[PDB]
Design a protein around this ligand. Structure first.
Ligand SMILES: *[C@@H]1O[C@H](CO)[C@@H](O[C@@H]2O[C@H](CO)[C@@H](O)[C@H](O)[C@H]2NC(C)=O)[C@H](O)[C@H]1NC(C)=O
Ligand SMILES: *[C@@H]1O[C@H](CO)[C@@H](O[C@@H]2O[C@H](CO)[C@@H](O)[C@H](O)[C@H]2NC(C)=O)[C@H](O)[C@H]1NC(C)=O
Ligand SMILES: *[C@@H]1O[C@H](CO)[C@@H](O[C@@H]2O[C@H](CO)[C@@H](O)[C@H](O)[C@H]2NC(C)=O)[C@H](O)[C@H]1NC(C)=O
Ligand SMILES: *[C@@H]1O[C@H](CO)[C@@H](O[C@@H]2O[C@H](CO)[C@@H](O)[C@H](O)[C@H]2NC(C)=O)[C@H](O)[C@H]1NC(C)=O
Ligand SMILES: *[C@@H]1O[C@H](CO)[C@@H](O)[C@H](O)[C@H]1NC(C)=O
Lengths: 314, 71, 228
């Protein structure tokens, strides 16, 4: 599930005009569009951080896993953080980062996100520790520790199966769970189209920005596309008409870009709300809704970070 | 009084090794607050370690009726 | 009952105090009015822009010039103002879509948390949901969620099942705990120890398959009755 898109920003006069200065003097009489663009882009940028905070920052405590990683035959090494690596990330998270991937500052910029990747990873680790060591009680009050086989027994009782079914077949279920985790890792490694959505988001943003920077090179019906050449060629009374046409065309293109950005931001906000609901209901508790947290009867789920998104293991 | 962050260059505020809750978001995990004006790395939350073991449980003995507001 | 009623009254008083004291609580409702007012003000301000023409006054252009180039000037003015109006309409449409989504969410919350009890986690307040009450507000609705929160936890030693006469006993609805010497079965969300009997436990197989089973006796209610 994608969560947030890249925070972008634009410089009005740098793009609309060039390196010249009296072009800005002509620009000053066309209106106050720059305020509109700055306000809208600032709103989008703050909405991105709001989406990230809503999706991830759901617990006020930073729980830690116990030093001994023994849970009655269950293997959690694949999702738990790896101290060996400098970035302190799970192997699944490392694979996700590696599977997801010029600098022409013509007014266009990119504001860095407020929450770095390490803090998101720390939130995911805290959520994993809370849901492993204390079941779901940590999501509705103080954290209460419960042995993991007992918690799985409670979950089986919740799905309508007696506890003896688990307690007589603990080893088989642990083996099946470990094999399933291994197959998930292999399938994520070997599938190119598995992570399509985040790559699509990145491609959309990059392609829109490149289209914007490319549209600057069109004459828009003028004699030349170089403003300085026009100023150095014609008597200002009609160079004014030429540059008026140019400025109107570039302003229209930039307005189109702003509208597309607003629509995409709205869609991403809706997706982030859905992701927040999934995190609240499938992770911090058990859900009886059909197909909402995976195919079949739901037992539990685990979160993982990803570039501009989240991955749920149901 | 000059600081270099991933977002850019900050003038007028001094870095503090301490950590608090984010008040004025600056970026790249850096926030600013007034107390002079200081800048710091925001703190995610209070750290807590649970006493997990193989055969121990915890059971509540009291409750609280709480009322919350949603707009 | 009496303690619950006292806690509920104190909670609602604290809610009234918090609403009366915190100014930023109602920011969500304030933001709609603030955005609409500033958008309308910006639309008004756009009217006094030359849009690249000599003068921003229409009748000034009419009076001070002949039709030939006055027509061009008025064409420019009309195009600029029409474009501004179109931009405002698009902004209003987007805001209306977002507000409609929020209204649908509020309707779902009203239908689920108020008209009944919901088991969805965190959907109707933090903690175990009990009930809720609606209130009106300028262009909005305020929900008061009454919920249950455990507190004052205590540690105990637990076992999965009980081996007794070669049979395995499992709790029917509770969980086995022990203070260190004796064993009891208690409900999940509240400490209420009870003597372990054959009515709150069920038997399934022998005690050689489960891991961590412990030894203890299971009292039988019908044994004293048959004894006499
Ligand atoms: C849990 O699973 C991990 C891998 O999923 C196991 O780590 C493997 O251990 C063997 C033997 O020590 C190595 O040959 C493999 O290379 C390890 N795999 C990886 C991916 O590093 C681990 O032994 C399992 N058990 C525990 C208790 O962690
Ligand atoms: C459960 O908690 C409540 C409060 O959270 C306790 O009620 C308080 O008890 C103390 C000591 O008797 C009194 O001084 C307070 O006035 C009580 N509060 C109220 C609102 O009446 C209650 O005693 C606790 N129950 C147990 C079994 O410890
Ligand atoms: C564990 O609970 C049992 C059951 O209440 C305790 O045994 C009884 O405790 C009460 C209260 O002190 C005494 O009046 C009874 O005489 C006890 N019965 C027996 C058979 O000893 C037991 O003391 C508790 N253990 C601990 C360590 O608190
Ligand atoms: C629970 O009680 C049973 C029977 O009283 C114990 O089983 C016996 O254990 C001894 C010691 O290992 C053996 O010599 C016997 O052959 C066992 N008998 C049977 C029928 O299994 C059992 O060890 C006890 N468990 C605990 C934890 O004390
Ligand atoms: C008791 O806990 C330790 C670690 O806390 C674990 O190694 C051991 O297997 C547990 N005992 C049983 C019977 O599982």
């Amino acid at each position: 599930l994608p969560v947030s898109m890249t925070k972008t920003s634009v410089d009005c006069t740098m793009y609309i005009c060039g390196d010249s200065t009296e072009c800005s003097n002509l620009l000053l009489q066309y209106g106050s569009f720059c305020t509109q663009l700055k306000r809208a882009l600032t709103g989008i940028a703050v909405e991105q951080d709001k989406n990230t905070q809503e999706v991830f920052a759901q617990v006020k405590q930073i729980y830690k896993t116990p030093p001994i990683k023994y849970f009655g035959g269950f293997n959690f090494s694949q999702i738990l953080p790896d101290p060996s690596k400098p970035s302190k990330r799970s192997p699944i998270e490392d694979l996700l980062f590696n599977k997801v991937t010029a600098q022409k500052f013509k007014g266009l910029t990119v504001l860095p996100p407020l929450l770095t990747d390490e803090m998101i990873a720390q939130y995911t680790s805290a959520l994993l520790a809370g849901t492993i060591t204390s079941g779901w009680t940590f999501g509705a009050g103080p954290a209460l520790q419960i042995p993991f086989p007992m918690q799985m027994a409670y979950r089986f009782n919740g799905i309508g199966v007696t506890q003896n079914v688990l307690y007589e077949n603990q080893k088989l279920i642990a083996n099946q769970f470990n094999s399933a985790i291994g197959k998930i890792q292999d399938s994520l490694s070997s599938t190119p189209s598995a992570l399509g959505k985040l790559q699509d988001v990145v491609n959309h943003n990059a392609q829109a920005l490149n289209t914007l920077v490319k549209q600057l090179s069109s004459k828009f019906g003028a004699i030349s596309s170089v403003l300085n050449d026009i100023f150095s060629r014609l008597d200002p009374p009609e160079a004014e008409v030429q540059i008026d046409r140019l400025i109107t065309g570039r302003l229209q293109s930039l307005q189109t870009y702003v509208t597309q950005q607003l629509i995409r931001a709205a869609e991403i906000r809706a997706s982030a709300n859905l992701a927040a609901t999934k995190m609240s209901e499938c992770v911090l508790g058990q859900s009886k809704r059909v197909d909402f947290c995976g195919k079949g009867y739901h037992l539990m789920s685990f979160p993982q970070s990803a570039p501009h998104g989240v991955v749920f293991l149901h | 009084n000059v600081f270099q962050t991933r977002a850019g260059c900050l003038i007028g505020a001094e870095y503090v090794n301490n950590s608090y809750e984010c008040d004025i978001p600056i970026g790249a995990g850096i926030c600013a607050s007034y107390q002079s004006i200081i800048a710091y790395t925001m703190s995610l939350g209070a750290e807590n370690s649970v006493a997990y073991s193989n055969n121990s449980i915890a059971i509540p003995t009291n409750f609280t009726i709480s009322v919350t507001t949603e707009i | 009952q009496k303690l619950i009623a006292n806690q509920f009254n104190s909670a609602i008083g604290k809610i009234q105090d918090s609403l009366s004291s915190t100014p930023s609580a109602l920011g969500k409702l304030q933001d709609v009015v603030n955005h609409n007012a500033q958008a309308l003000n910006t639309l008004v301000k756009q009217l006094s822009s030359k849009f690249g023409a000599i003068s921003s006054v229409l009748n000034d252009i009419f009076s001070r010039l002949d039709p030939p180039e006055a027509e061009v000037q008025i064409d420019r003015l009309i195009t600029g103002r029409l474009q501004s109006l179109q931009t405002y309409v698009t902004q209003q449409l987007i805001r209306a879509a977002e507000i409609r989504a929020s209204a649908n969410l509020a309707a779902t919350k009203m239908s689920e948390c108020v008209l009944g009890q919901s088991k969805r986690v965190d959907f109707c307040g933090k903690g175990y949901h009990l009930m809720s009450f609606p209130q009106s507000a300028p262009h909005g609705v305020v929900f008061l969620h009454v919920t249950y929160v455990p507190a004052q936890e205590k540690n105990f030693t637990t076992a999965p099942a009980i081996c007794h006469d070669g049979k395995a006993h499992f709790p029917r609805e509770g969980v086995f705990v022990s203070n260190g010497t004796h064993w009891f079965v208690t409900q999940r969300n509240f400490y209420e120890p009870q003597i372990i009997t054959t009515d709150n436990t069920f038997v399934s197989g022998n005690c050689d398959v489960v891991i961590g089973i412990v030894n203890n006796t299971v009292y039988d209610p019908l044994q004293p009755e048959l004894d006499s």
